[PDB]
Amino acid sequence: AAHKSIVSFKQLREDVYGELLNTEQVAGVKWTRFPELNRILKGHRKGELTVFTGPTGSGKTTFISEVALDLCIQGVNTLWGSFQINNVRLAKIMLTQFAMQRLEENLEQYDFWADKFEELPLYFMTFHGQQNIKTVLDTMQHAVYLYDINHVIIDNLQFMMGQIDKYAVQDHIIGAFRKFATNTSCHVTLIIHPRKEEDDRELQTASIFGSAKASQEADNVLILQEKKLVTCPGRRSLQVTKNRFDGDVGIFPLDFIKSSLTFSAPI
Amino acid sequence: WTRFPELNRILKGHRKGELTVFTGPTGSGKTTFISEVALDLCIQGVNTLWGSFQINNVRLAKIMLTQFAMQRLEENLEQYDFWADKFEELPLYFMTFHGQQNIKTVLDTMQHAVYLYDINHVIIDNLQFMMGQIDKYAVQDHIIGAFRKFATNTSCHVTLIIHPRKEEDDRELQTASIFGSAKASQEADNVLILQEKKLVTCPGRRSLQVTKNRFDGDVGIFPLDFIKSSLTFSAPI
Amino acid sequence: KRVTLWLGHDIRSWEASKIFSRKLGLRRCSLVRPGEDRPCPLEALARGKNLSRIIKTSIPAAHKSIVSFKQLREDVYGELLNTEQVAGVK
DNA sequence: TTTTTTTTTTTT
Ligand SMILES: Nc1ncnc2c1ncn2[C@@H]1O[C@H](COP(=O)(O)OP(=O)(O)OP(=O)(O)O)[C@@H](O)[C@H]1O
Ligand SMILES: Nc1ncnc2c1ncn2[C@@H]1O[C@H](COP(=O)(O)OP(=O)(O)OP(=O)(O)O)[C@@H](O)[C@H]1O
Ligand SMILES: [Mg+2]
Ligand SMILES: [Mg+2]
């Protein structure tokens, strides 16, 4: 009675007590600019993999940038994988979102905001085109070992994966990402494009392009919705279909302030 | 844009390094409108290259010269020399290809022309004609990815004209109607799309929508009218 | 027969080389558009391999890209002349 | 044996 079959609570009781003691530490950093996400996702917890998807040109990158900027203010060290937008335009968008005002109008205040934003724990990767899973993941481990980052975002898996036996390399890379997340306790965010819909159906959790493993092994399936008008549709809606921790599903409308390029509070 | 005031308040201009896709109903005037846009852009600074994979290079040149002349040049051949000479100095180029060609040979000519003429606007007509030759729905994605990589590594505005799938002739063309995989819709920066109001005799009243706009996201439509005499798409009326 | 332009690598030289090639026999002298400097700096910078490969791989002056209304003028004029022949038998 | 993507027929 000494092999790898772990014994009962006689040695696991202490871990359970420790987890139950810090109930406010299991659910980690909360959101400041997003009161709705504080009552749905119950916060941001390390070691979980989440997938993001939405209609074409619906603002997936902009919303993720806002969430990352909100989380990076207090404690979270973030790493950005910009596989679609070059690192300068993304930097402009994030800076404009932080400044809460059109920085192009006033270049005299550029120095102050740049200095105040310079010390935040923000990191980027210079990868822009198609890359294999071996080279990108090595930089992830190297950045974890040095800067101690706890929130990595990859932009458009379909872009990086796109190069055979398709519908299988995607499963391999997403499994590698899940293994890296669980072995290191870093919140990995993935933006996976959906399959071709008919533009009049609400995007369900089964619309993820590829095998079903993406929805199976993910912990949060935050998905955007579009109400296609003829002129400036707006009124984007966000749904949370799956939630492993404290399962809760809900939606809430969002409005877009054009001046600040930020997703305002629900109205 | 100069002849298109509406496009100055929707796409906010023409920017290098972006790939745009054009689509519309069959025989609705996709080639003519693209010709007008390219001619209006090439006037000031833009050096353009044309892919005439459906229309032979003589008819396309005739249409472009008619649009530049703003009148029926066939009526007055005495004025042909003056407008031909005024049209000669414009930085315009074409490719001699007319039939099906693989992506490896057409792309090399683009690089060779970029290295010499410093062009920043290459237009490809009828991607379905170029792709038409297996594993279909995969070569199209490959060539679209190659075009996107070439555009981002060279910073030249690549315009693509892709046919839509077989519609019911009574439904507005959505952004998901692009023939092939959905890679074109996610991967392109502008999804300029034409609309048709099918009448029984000379319908007209073509409508243009902008479903996607990566830079300064704005969506809007504006009707267009066609001056038959000058073969030009006039200002919205 | 096959000349190779070796103008300066800076500005106002590559364009001058293009202009000279256009003035001279087109499709007969290939210009050089490499990232290295002139042959003297290349020899100084130990770029002999570059000076032997890039020069031998010079970009040809012409290509299968038909020109603007310097050619095709006759065909367009002809098609605009016998407009009654564009539409054939009635 | 999954997994998109276009196209014709039948029957909820
Ligand atoms: N709700 C909204 N209302 C108006 N404009 C918006 C809204 N959301 C985003 N935009 C605009 O759309 C532009 C593109 O945004 P973004 O880059 O996030 O799209 P994307 O999700 O990356 O597109 P794709 O899905 O094709 O990659 C932004 O410049 C932004 O100004
Ligand atoms: N709005 C309009 N009203 C009347 N005639 C038009 C209009 N637009 C285009 N045309 C005519 O239709 C003819 C064909 O135009 P064009 O070559 O652009 O079609 P196309 O888009 O190439 O067709 P396809 O989609 O089958 O390739 C032109 O000669 C033009 O005179
Ligand atoms: Mg994006
Ligand atoms: Mg056509």
XYZ file of C-alpha atoms (C1' of nucleotides) and ligand atoms in Angstrom:
670
model
C 0.000 0.000 0.000
C 2.698 2.467 -1.041
C 2.379 2.910 -4.828
C 1.265 6.039 -6.697
C -2.411 5.658 -5.720
C -2.724 8.684 -3.447
C -4.052 8.022 0.055
C -7.260 9.624 1.364
C -7.673 12.958 3.183
C -5.197 11.947 5.903
C -2.647 13.996 3.924
C -4.993 16.063 1.712
C -7.031 17.623 4.538
C -4.556 20.482 5.001
C -4.749 21.534 1.343
C -8.557 21.559 1.454
C -8.491 23.655 4.630
C -6.034 26.084 3.051
C -8.188 26.444 -0.058
C -11.331 26.967 2.032
C -9.616 29.567 4.237
C -8.730 32.030 1.451
C -12.076 32.045 -0.333
C -11.281 35.517 -1.704
C -7.990 34.232 -3.159
C -9.444 31.405 -5.270
C -11.286 34.108 -7.192
C -8.444 36.458 -8.043
C -8.288 39.994 -9.399
C -11.660 41.601 -10.060
C -12.450 44.163 -12.756
C -12.733 47.919 -12.226
C -14.181 49.190 -15.524
C -16.398 46.100 -16.018
C -18.860 45.742 -13.125
C -20.889 43.165 -15.069
C -17.979 40.727 -15.364
C -17.607 40.849 -11.569
C -21.047 39.230 -11.149
C -20.740 36.632 -13.935
C -17.170 35.310 -14.026
C -16.723 36.105 -10.293
C -13.266 37.507 -11.095
C -10.108 36.347 -12.846
C -8.491 33.091 -11.709
C -5.011 31.895 -12.634
C -4.400 28.570 -14.340
C -7.499 28.591 -16.570
C -7.732 28.618 -20.368
C -10.354 30.812 -22.043
C -11.463 31.153 -25.671
C -12.839 34.288 -27.328
C -14.846 34.466 -30.545
C -17.249 36.712 -32.401
C -18.493 37.918 -35.778
C -16.062 39.312 -38.328
C -14.895 42.821 -37.500
C -17.023 42.945 -34.350
C -14.247 44.333 -32.151
C -12.730 41.178 -30.684
C -9.249 42.706 -30.484
C -10.493 46.008 -29.043
C -12.507 44.371 -26.252
C -9.665 42.004 -25.337
C -7.316 44.991 -25.233
C -9.680 46.756 -22.825
C -9.941 43.694 -20.564
C -6.163 43.238 -20.541
C -5.613 46.925 -19.769
C -8.136 46.788 -16.923
C -6.464 43.711 -15.421
C -2.877 44.938 -15.897
C -3.416 48.060 -13.768
C -3.388 46.461 -10.323
C -1.267 43.311 -10.278
C -1.524 41.280 -13.455
C 1.512 41.065 -15.737
C 0.325 40.585 -19.315
C 1.919 39.325 -22.520
C 0.455 40.144 -25.934
C 0.718 38.045 -29.068
C -0.078 40.380 -31.966
C -0.354 38.050 -34.956
C -2.712 40.317 -36.945
C -2.060 43.946 -35.933
C 1.512 45.218 -35.878
C 2.887 46.184 -32.475
C 2.694 49.953 -33.146
C -1.019 50.203 -33.943
C -1.914 47.958 -31.004
C 0.239 50.156 -28.767
C -1.632 53.217 -30.038
C -5.004 51.597 -29.369
C -4.052 50.539 -25.844
C -2.565 53.963 -25.065
C -5.698 55.717 -26.336
C -7.863 53.406 -24.227
C -5.737 54.181 -21.167
C -5.736 57.952 -21.707
C -9.573 58.071 -21.724
C -9.280 60.831 -24.343
C -8.121 61.427 -27.910
C -4.365 61.795 -27.483
C -4.017 63.056 -31.066
C -5.840 66.261 -30.107
C -3.265 67.196 -27.439
C 0.364 66.283 -28.117
C 1.495 68.507 -25.232
C 0.123 65.943 -22.760
C 1.644 62.997 -24.648
C 4.789 62.978 -22.503
C 2.878 62.848 -19.210
C 0.627 59.949 -20.221
C 3.503 58.061 -21.858
C 5.578 58.402 -18.685
C 2.670 57.312 -16.482
C 2.036 54.303 -18.754
C 5.724 53.409 -19.112
C 6.101 51.678 -15.730
C 3.147 49.291 -16.091
C 4.032 45.589 -16.491
C 3.270 45.401 -20.217
C 4.997 43.108 -22.704
C 4.674 42.244 -26.387
C 6.026 39.665 -28.814
C 7.399 40.806 -32.163
C 5.935 37.812 -34.021
C 3.642 38.989 -36.817
C 3.297 36.202 -39.401
C 2.711 32.457 -39.354
C 4.812 30.647 -36.749
C 5.098 27.068 -35.553
C 3.996 26.081 -32.059
C 7.555 25.180 -31.020
C 9.135 28.642 -31.400
C 6.281 30.685 -29.912
C 5.847 28.474 -26.838
C 9.562 28.678 -26.022
C 9.323 32.469 -25.738
C 6.274 32.020 -23.499
C 8.245 29.827 -21.089
C 11.216 32.198 -21.192
C 9.002 35.197 -20.395
C 7.312 33.290 -17.567
C 10.687 32.332 -16.083
C 11.835 35.982 -15.980
C 9.002 38.537 -15.865
C 6.551 36.254 -13.993
C 3.583 36.924 -16.268
C 0.136 35.541 -15.438
C -1.975 36.583 -18.456
C -0.960 35.672 -22.017
C -3.154 36.567 -24.997
C -2.740 35.033 -28.481
C -4.472 36.932 -31.368
C -6.147 34.742 -34.058
C -5.104 31.126 -33.702
C -6.341 30.538 -37.252
C -3.608 32.932 -38.425
C -0.751 31.200 -36.599
C -2.043 27.679 -37.281
C -2.691 28.312 -40.986
C -0.010 26.609 -43.069
C -0.953 17.960 -43.401
C -4.136 16.461 -41.908
C -5.937 19.671 -41.023
C -8.436 19.724 -38.129
C -5.701 17.910 -36.172
C -2.859 20.428 -35.865
C -5.364 22.777 -34.219
C -6.152 20.119 -31.614
C -2.437 19.514 -31.035
C -1.625 23.193 -30.521
C -4.648 23.830 -28.285
C -3.722 20.790 -26.202
C -0.185 22.133 -25.904
C -1.590 25.485 -24.769
C -3.802 23.794 -22.169
C -0.852 21.749 -20.893
C 1.285 24.889 -20.638
C -1.494 26.696 -18.767
C -2.058 23.885 -16.266
C 1.659 23.230 -15.708
C 2.502 26.909 -15.127
C -0.725 28.558 -13.836
C -0.995 31.347 -16.404
C -4.353 32.496 -17.779
C -4.120 31.785 -21.512
C -6.568 33.680 -23.732
C -7.222 32.418 -27.263
C -9.105 34.226 -30.032
C -10.507 31.561 -32.369
C -12.428 32.635 -35.453
C -15.881 31.099 -35.989
C -17.075 29.145 -38.993
C -19.026 30.784 -41.810
C -22.528 31.559 -40.541
C -25.404 33.124 -42.504
C -25.211 36.519 -40.697
C -28.667 36.161 -39.079
C -28.004 33.488 -36.424
C -26.791 34.125 -32.892
C -23.320 32.645 -32.456
C -23.644 29.524 -30.313
C -20.890 27.645 -28.486
C -20.740 25.064 -31.304
C -19.651 27.650 -33.900
C -15.957 27.385 -32.981
C -13.997 26.502 -36.107
C -12.259 23.151 -35.757
C -12.813 20.086 -33.600
C -15.011 20.174 -30.499
C -11.933 19.913 -28.248
C -11.669 23.715 -28.206
C -14.965 24.086 -26.346
C -14.390 20.879 -24.366
C -11.082 21.783 -22.698
C -11.739 25.518 -22.302
C -12.789 27.071 -18.998
C -14.443 30.247 -20.333
C -16.164 30.610 -23.697
C -16.808 34.374 -23.709
C -18.480 34.987 -27.071
C -19.534 38.227 -28.764
C -22.799 38.893 -30.591
C -23.620 41.334 -33.387
C -26.858 43.130 -34.266
C -26.140 43.944 -37.915
C -27.788 47.232 -38.856
C -27.320 49.055 -42.171
C -25.445 52.068 -40.755
C -23.229 51.876 -37.641
C -24.818 48.815 -35.977
C -23.250 48.989 -32.529
C -24.964 47.575 -29.442
C -22.616 44.608 -29.192
C -23.625 41.894 -26.723
C -21.340 39.569 -24.760
C -22.358 36.085 -23.612
C -20.695 33.621 -21.239
C -21.848 30.171 -22.340
C -19.530 28.049 -20.164
C -18.076 28.729 -16.716
C -16.235 25.929 -14.918
C -15.932 27.824 -11.618
C -19.297 28.918 -10.177
C -21.228 28.206 -13.364
C -23.102 31.328 -14.431
C -24.463 32.333 -17.839
C -25.652 35.807 -18.780
C -25.552 38.626 -21.302
C -25.202 42.396 -21.098
C -25.251 45.094 -23.802
C -22.207 47.281 -24.383
C -21.747 50.711 -25.945
C -18.690 52.042 -27.763
C -17.393 55.552 -27.081
C -15.791 56.581 -30.373
C -13.766 59.387 -28.775
C -11.900 57.175 -26.293
C -12.000 53.929 -28.342
C -13.149 52.143 -25.176
C -16.067 49.817 -24.487
C -18.109 51.775 -21.958
C -20.171 50.390 -19.108
C -23.506 48.777 -20.045
C -26.207 51.338 -20.780
C -11.037 60.361 -53.434
C -12.041 63.200 -55.758
C -14.943 61.863 -57.848
C -16.312 59.871 -54.875
C -17.151 62.267 -52.026
C -19.074 59.556 -50.160
C -16.017 57.300 -49.913
C -14.178 60.105 -48.095
C -16.585 59.863 -45.132
C -16.787 56.059 -44.846
C -13.362 54.530 -45.509
C -11.653 57.861 -44.645
C -9.389 57.488 -47.691
C -7.041 54.917 -49.198
C -4.302 53.461 -46.988
C -1.338 51.319 -47.996
C -0.758 47.878 -46.526
C -4.402 46.739 -46.478
C -6.118 43.970 -48.442
C -9.669 44.672 -49.622
C -12.210 42.366 -51.269
C -14.873 43.353 -53.798
C -17.976 41.356 -54.672
C -21.409 41.750 -56.191
C -24.067 40.193 -58.409
C -22.938 38.751 -61.723
C -22.845 41.351 -64.483
C -23.626 44.176 -62.059
C -20.694 46.441 -62.932
C -17.912 45.237 -60.650
C -15.193 45.783 -63.261
C -16.450 49.235 -64.277
C -16.624 50.520 -60.693
C -13.146 49.203 -59.867
C -11.878 50.898 -63.027
C -13.383 54.213 -61.911
C -11.892 53.902 -58.416
C -8.448 52.999 -59.762
C -8.546 55.832 -62.301
C -9.538 58.368 -59.648
C -6.792 57.154 -57.300
C -4.049 57.010 -59.958
C -4.476 60.701 -60.833
C -2.615 62.207 -57.880
C 0.011 59.823 -56.524
C -0.995 56.182 -56.715
C 0.917 53.906 -59.085
C -1.470 51.101 -60.011
C -1.180 47.708 -61.683
C -4.162 45.936 -63.237
C -5.025 42.260 -63.410
C -7.172 41.801 -66.520
C -7.975 38.104 -66.209
C -11.486 38.387 -67.697
C -11.385 41.379 -70.072
C -8.638 41.580 -72.678
C -6.197 44.466 -72.295
C -7.642 46.372 -75.287
C -11.252 46.611 -74.096
C -10.069 47.534 -70.595
C -7.841 50.263 -72.028
C -10.754 51.539 -74.124
C -13.039 51.692 -71.079
C -10.379 53.430 -68.983
C -9.709 55.997 -71.716
C -13.443 56.639 -72.079
C -13.762 57.190 -68.324
C -10.739 59.504 -68.282
C -12.086 61.486 -71.246
C -15.476 61.997 -69.517
C -17.150 61.769 -72.941
C -17.770 59.418 -75.857
C -14.378 59.535 -77.561
C -15.743 57.633 -80.573
C -17.804 60.688 -81.542
C -14.688 62.852 -82.030
C -11.544 61.097 -83.256
C -9.885 64.469 -83.917
C -9.504 64.925 -80.145
C -8.144 61.392 -79.667
C -4.488 62.421 -79.936
C -4.715 65.147 -77.281
C -6.381 62.993 -74.629
C -4.199 59.999 -75.507
C -1.075 62.106 -74.963
C -2.490 63.498 -71.715
C -3.263 59.914 -70.626
C 0.203 58.633 -71.565
C 2.148 60.083 -68.619
C -0.064 58.482 -65.961
C 1.682 55.715 -63.983
C -0.476 52.853 -65.272
C 0.508 49.252 -66.001
C -1.078 45.937 -66.950
C -0.119 42.266 -66.994
C -0.268 40.342 -70.269
C -1.822 37.289 -68.585
C -5.330 36.408 -69.766
C -5.890 32.712 -69.003
C -5.632 30.500 -65.935
C -2.332 30.919 -64.101
C -0.886 29.435 -60.936
C -0.196 31.624 -57.917
C 3.570 31.122 -58.267
C 3.910 32.911 -61.630
C 1.521 35.834 -61.084
C 3.122 36.725 -57.744
C 6.633 36.935 -59.214
C 5.484 39.562 -61.717
C 4.033 41.580 -58.830
C 7.382 41.546 -57.020
C 9.252 42.442 -60.208
C 6.908 45.373 -60.843
C 7.174 46.555 -57.230
C 10.979 46.514 -57.400
C 10.928 48.702 -60.546
C 7.866 50.959 -60.846
C 7.260 51.462 -57.098
C 3.561 50.508 -57.338
C 1.282 50.593 -54.296
C -2.042 49.336 -55.710
C -2.339 45.971 -57.480
C -5.831 44.890 -58.548
C -6.712 41.272 -59.334
C -9.917 40.478 -61.214
C -11.904 37.248 -60.852
C -9.984 35.225 -58.284
C -12.283 32.349 -59.268
C -10.809 32.461 -62.788
C -7.243 32.326 -61.458
C -8.068 29.567 -58.965
C -10.117 27.529 -61.452
C -8.147 24.378 -62.240
C -7.104 18.912 -55.855
C -8.884 19.516 -52.525
C -10.917 22.562 -53.496
C -11.684 25.209 -50.838
C -8.017 24.898 -49.821
C -6.096 26.305 -52.793
C -8.267 29.422 -52.533
C -7.292 29.868 -48.886
C -3.644 29.291 -49.812
C -3.652 31.965 -52.517
C -5.551 34.399 -50.274
C -2.950 33.874 -47.554
C -0.160 34.389 -50.078
C -1.765 37.650 -51.217
C -2.139 38.840 -47.619
C 1.489 37.995 -46.826
C 2.651 39.808 -49.966
C 0.546 42.848 -49.056
C 1.789 43.040 -45.466
C 5.427 42.459 -46.448
C 5.343 45.101 -49.213
C 2.660 47.609 -48.076
C 0.643 47.715 -51.296
C -3.159 47.898 -51.316
C -4.293 44.645 -52.938
C -7.864 44.623 -54.267
C -9.580 41.301 -54.981
C -12.801 40.711 -56.929
C -14.433 37.467 -55.766
C -17.727 36.124 -57.076
C -20.458 35.231 -54.576
C -22.186 31.891 -54.247
C -25.434 31.206 -56.100
C -28.009 33.443 -54.414
C -31.782 33.529 -54.982
C -31.681 36.877 -56.883
C -34.011 38.414 -54.249
C -31.714 38.525 -51.194
C -29.251 41.255 -50.265
C -25.666 40.041 -50.584
C -24.386 39.527 -47.046
C -20.729 39.535 -46.028
C -20.945 35.737 -45.638
C -21.832 35.237 -49.323
C -18.193 35.187 -50.467
C -17.632 31.998 -52.447
C -15.223 29.563 -50.821
C -14.073 29.318 -47.223
C -14.633 32.120 -44.721
C -10.906 32.938 -44.574
C -11.399 35.831 -47.001
C -13.973 37.492 -44.744
C -11.872 37.305 -41.562
C -8.567 38.063 -43.285
C -9.539 41.061 -45.441
C -9.574 44.670 -44.252
C -12.414 46.034 -46.415
C -15.426 44.131 -47.721
C -16.767 46.621 -50.287
C -19.845 44.872 -51.675
C -22.290 45.839 -54.426
C -26.070 45.445 -54.349
C -28.590 45.147 -57.180
C -32.283 46.043 -57.439
C -33.434 43.684 -60.203
C -36.025 45.423 -62.366
C -37.400 44.040 -65.643
C -35.871 46.616 -68.020
C -32.509 48.281 -67.258
C -32.677 48.157 -63.431
C -29.863 50.522 -62.524
C -29.582 52.186 -59.117
C -26.593 50.178 -57.932
C -25.953 50.352 -54.184
C -22.608 49.959 -52.412
C -22.226 48.783 -48.814
C -19.164 48.697 -46.563
C -19.792 45.803 -44.181
C -16.324 45.817 -42.575
C -13.756 48.554 -41.964
C -10.686 47.731 -39.876
C -9.499 51.349 -39.636
C -12.114 53.736 -38.208
C -14.937 51.202 -38.224
C -17.843 52.686 -40.159
C -20.680 51.063 -42.110
C -22.885 52.886 -44.597
C -24.519 52.722 -48.005
C -25.044 55.234 -50.794
C -26.887 54.756 -54.105
C -25.007 55.237 -57.362
C -26.147 56.281 -60.828
C -24.544 55.474 -64.176
C -23.960 57.973 -66.979
C -24.208 55.798 -70.088
C -22.534 58.410 -72.300
C -19.281 58.627 -70.325
C -19.295 55.063 -68.895
C -18.679 56.587 -65.455
C -20.328 56.028 -62.082
C -21.490 59.525 -61.200
C -21.939 61.103 -57.792
C -24.867 59.789 -55.715
C -28.193 61.313 -56.725
C 24.602 42.545 -75.168
C 23.843 42.116 -71.438
C 25.025 45.171 -69.506
C 24.640 45.501 -65.731
C 23.975 48.913 -64.204
C 26.175 49.664 -61.182
C 24.918 53.061 -60.041
C 24.902 54.296 -56.463
C 22.837 52.584 -53.792
C 21.603 55.846 -52.232
C 18.712 58.049 -53.391
C 18.853 60.011 -56.676
C 20.989 57.179 -58.115
C 18.691 54.168 -58.517
C 16.089 56.413 -60.158
C 18.849 57.887 -62.327
C 19.915 54.352 -63.257
C 16.302 53.518 -64.205
C 16.084 56.677 -66.316
C 19.368 55.881 -68.075
C 18.226 52.314 -68.776
C 14.962 53.629 -70.228
C 16.910 56.080 -72.400
C 19.276 53.312 -73.535
C 18.220 50.030 -75.138
C 15.376 48.635 -73.055
C 15.280 44.910 -72.237
C 19.048 44.793 -72.831
C 20.737 46.146 -69.664
C 19.664 44.852 -66.255
C 19.754 47.250 -63.314
C 20.988 46.405 -59.811
C 18.637 46.809 -56.832
C 20.552 45.173 -53.960
C 20.760 46.250 -50.344
C 24.543 46.641 -50.466
C 26.464 49.830 -51.224
C 28.534 50.624 -54.336
C 31.173 48.133 -55.550
C 33.974 50.024 -53.788
C 32.242 49.939 -50.365
C 31.277 46.314 -51.027
C 34.941 45.442 -51.571
C 35.802 47.463 -48.461
C 33.059 45.704 -46.463
C 34.254 42.250 -47.645
C 31.130 41.835 -49.805
C 32.916 40.031 -52.638
C 30.394 37.195 -52.496
C 27.592 39.766 -52.654
C 29.381 41.615 -55.467
C 29.597 38.319 -57.391
C 26.074 36.999 -56.699
C 23.779 40.045 -56.505
C 25.431 41.616 -59.558
C 25.012 38.341 -61.452
C 21.397 38.234 -60.184
C 20.591 41.776 -61.314
C 16.925 42.589 -61.909
C 16.109 42.523 -65.652
C 15.103 45.859 -67.144
C 11.858 44.584 -68.696
C 9.255 41.945 -67.864
C 5.941 40.517 -69.072
C 4.066 43.582 -67.796
C 2.653 45.530 -70.728
C 3.235 49.287 -70.723
C 0.717 52.155 -70.547
C -0.536 54.094 -73.562
C 2.756 53.995 -75.417
C 1.948 50.529 -76.680
C -1.687 49.470 -77.248
C -2.251 52.919 -78.792
C -2.758 51.471 -82.275
C -5.187 48.785 -81.091
C -7.284 51.246 -79.075
C -7.338 53.707 -81.978
C -8.418 50.952 -84.357
C -11.181 49.728 -82.056
C -12.356 53.333 -81.673
C -12.226 53.838 -85.463
C -14.410 51.001 -86.798
C -16.891 51.097 -83.930
C -19.470 49.595 -86.294
C -17.255 46.486 -86.457
C -17.138 46.008 -82.669
C -20.742 44.807 -82.869
C -20.719 42.314 -85.715
C -23.486 40.904 -87.887
C -26.939 42.222 -87.039
C -15.391 8.735 -38.533
C -15.045 13.557 -37.722
C -15.464 18.482 -40.187
C -16.307 22.576 -43.301
C -18.695 24.240 -47.871
C -21.781 24.594 -52.094
C -26.050 22.537 -54.549
C -30.456 20.037 -55.678
C -35.238 17.550 -53.420
C -38.368 16.211 -50.092
C -41.162 17.107 -45.559
C -41.598 18.425 -41.487
N -19.163 48.685 -31.069
C -18.467 49.355 -32.017
N -19.001 50.417 -32.658
C -18.321 51.092 -33.602
N -17.071 50.777 -33.986
C -16.414 49.735 -33.425
C -17.092 48.947 -32.387
N -16.229 47.988 -32.009
C -15.097 48.146 -32.740
N -15.211 49.185 -33.587
C -14.171 49.651 -34.536
O -13.754 48.584 -35.386
C -12.352 48.685 -35.633
C -11.727 47.300 -35.713
O -11.743 46.713 -34.417
P -10.977 45.326 -34.143
O -9.569 45.442 -34.675
O -11.190 44.953 -32.698
O -11.785 44.273 -35.049
P -11.284 42.749 -35.164
O -12.154 41.910 -34.261
O -9.784 42.713 -35.005
O -11.642 42.366 -36.682
P -11.383 40.872 -37.217
O -12.408 40.047 -36.479
O -11.611 40.973 -38.705
O -9.954 40.589 -36.823
C -11.761 49.503 -34.496
O -10.911 50.528 -35.017
C -12.942 50.124 -33.780
O -12.850 51.549 -33.834
N -25.353 50.987 -63.349
C -25.307 50.580 -64.639
N -26.298 50.889 -65.503
C -26.265 50.490 -66.787
N -25.264 49.766 -67.316
C -24.204 49.389 -66.563
C -24.168 49.783 -65.149
N -23.028 49.284 -64.641
C -22.389 48.626 -65.640
N -23.093 48.686 -66.784
C -22.699 48.082 -68.078
O -22.432 46.689 -67.919
C -21.340 46.313 -68.759
C -20.484 45.254 -68.078
O -19.786 45.859 -66.995
P -18.680 45.029 -66.175
O -17.622 44.547 -67.138
O -18.272 45.852 -64.979
O -19.500 43.753 -65.641
P -18.745 42.621 -64.785
O -18.901 42.966 -63.325
O -17.367 42.415 -65.364
O -19.621 41.306 -65.075
P -19.295 39.936 -64.301
O -19.727 40.214 -62.884
O -20.127 38.903 -65.020
O -17.805 39.767 -64.476
C -20.545 47.577 -69.043
O -20.285 47.688 -70.444
C -21.421 48.725 -68.589
O -21.709 49.585 -69.694
Mg -8.748 40.933 -35.159
Mg -16.182 40.984 -64.553
